[PDB]
Ligand binder design. Structure first.
Ligand SMILES: CNC(=O)[C@@H](NC(=O)[C@H](OCc1ccc(-c2cccnc2)cc1)[C@H](O)[C@@H](O)[C@@H](OCc1ccc(-c2cccnc2)cc1)C(=O)N[C@H](C(=O)NC)C(C)C)C(C)C
Lengths: 99, 99
């Protein structure tokens, strides 16, 4: 579809059988979700953004559905104020910026 | 043009007669630029990012050219790791997300 930016580009995503709201963020290199439980091993990591860095748990090869489109990739879990879908997954669903 | 997301969507912007690179950021409500000098009075604003909140200087009706597209709007100046072109300006140049 074509999503305008008059409002925040929020979409529904499905991960681990849970339905959640997330922001399509072209400014984010990675995907970061609110604290939740995921299967498998994880690695500690620090990610920075506006306001500084936060500590997150890194899980690889996680399956996520974005507006029907399935995508696999790394997902970071931590104290983020909003769920962020970054470029690592945006590319997988063929999302592009146009003007 | 059509921009893919395999790399950061960095573009060249012109402001105050100078060229700088910035990120087309759909995850940002506002446009935030690294410390610089701008004309006029400024007002205070507190913005929140992934790592917390930071104080910035708000300048209004600032002319900024993004990839040949002229825009005039509000720009925030503060301690940001990178220049960010937010939705307030992306809408002015007709930018949309597609997939
Ligand atoms: C390498 N690091 C990244 O790639 C990081 N990217 C960013 O932070 C992007 O910024 C560019 C950027 C790129 C690289 C580095 C970097 C770092 C270290 C080293 N090198 C480069 C630093 C910044 C984002 O799109 C940013 O813009 C946006 O984040 C999403 C968001 C939206 C709403 C609330 C939110 C907060 C409070 C209430 N409601 C919502 C909280 C967060 C955000 O903070 N939006 C704000 C917003 O819209 N707030 C409402 C505006 C005002 C900026 C990711 C790991 C998340």
């Amino acid at each position: 579809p074509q999503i305008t930016l008059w409002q925040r580009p929020l979409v529904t995503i499905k991960i681990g059988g849970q339905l959640k709201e997330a922001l399509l963020d072209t400014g984010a290199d990675d995907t970061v979700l609110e604290e939740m439980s995921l299967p498998g091993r994880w690695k500690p990591k620090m990610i920075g953004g506006i306001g500084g860095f936060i500590k997150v748990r890194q899980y690889d090869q996680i399956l996520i559905e974005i507006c029907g489109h399935k995508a696999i990739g790394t997902v970071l879990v931590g104290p983020t104020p909003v769920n962020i879908i970054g470029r690592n997954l945006l590319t997988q669903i063929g999302c592009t910026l146009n003007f």
